[PDB]
Amino acid sequence: ALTLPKGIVFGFAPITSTTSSVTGVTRAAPPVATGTMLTAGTTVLVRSNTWTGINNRISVVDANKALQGFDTTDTTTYPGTSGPVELITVGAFVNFTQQGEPSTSGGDQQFWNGQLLEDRSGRQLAIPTFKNAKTLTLPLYMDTSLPWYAAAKAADARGEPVAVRMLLPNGDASYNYGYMSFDGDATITANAPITNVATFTFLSDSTLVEA
Template sequence: MSASLPNGAVLSIATTYGAAIPVTVLTNAAPPVATATAHGLTNLDILEVTSGWLGLDQRPARVAGSTTNNFNLEGHDTTSTTQFPAGTGIGSVRKVLTWTQISQVMDPATSGGDQRFVNWNYLEDGNAPERAKPTNKAAKVLILKLADDPAQAWNAVLKAADAAGTPRIIRLALPNGSFIYYNSYVGFDDEPSLGFNNIMQVSLTLTSAARFVRYAS
């Protein structure tokens, strides 16, 4: 058993990406093996995946077991042919080329992820309590306040990501050496808050486009 604190964690956003690399075969495996002729990727590269499998589409992945024409999508499991029908997962990947640290993070908060339900009664239930069945979960949102500082490089990067309206890979490097990667829509409000005797802050909202992936090191 263990307990961890996020103190000292470093948050970064993907600044630039390489060109999309077509994936011609994607296997049902853990991890799935991708075939892409002369892909040029190396182990530990971070990718954004585009796939015909919704359970893999837009998710971050790390390259492992790279050879000339194949590589593994580390941390993913596509063994279920019910969820991942064989032969239908092909698409493309693109590599994160550069990162920009999002520094001066204050007051992080999360919302969403709560379980939703469908509620109903049968006519013959009479006045019995209604029935409930779990459905999906609410979208996950990470809300961050950043100390206002126009000199920081993240201002321009976050403004551009907000304007583009497309997901960006977010990297959270934890003090224990592990990493969490998200793919999130970026909402950035660069108008600073004005509270007497309070640090001026700007607001960053990260809305998940797909489920995160975590690596122990």
């Protein structure tokens, strides 16, 4: 056990417009896209309606025809049949270099407050709802003549969601769907070199493409 935070390399990719409508996601096994012609090993967004937990997540076509990273065998909260499903292909990944110490922040949960009068001891109830958004920060060391600089600045200016990858040295990954802010401006300090900051934000659940 004890996964370690060493060797983690980040990276982001744009969302293209090529689309498919493969149907046949089976709830029993790790879900399968029946008859898709997409070559096994392409990261593809899933935007299928009529299902709750597969709204805006990201996965890879692998194994025979399945999208590993889903466990939709639970069906008391997963009613109906699959039907039509959207599949948008994601582009290539641009990898950050010269990074600092990532520091995830946020993700607290906001209870409800209010009490039933009848209680003799006047107990106060707390009902959990509305988990806060979870962000990420990743200080970088500035250099204008690097591939990630221009791509990050452009993807900031576009103002559209991207697909963030968090690649462990083991060979796994943790794909996310969310926005991506960038600074692109020097941050002078006492003696440390010029530092540059790239903030993240996740709009859905996280997946794990086991490898």
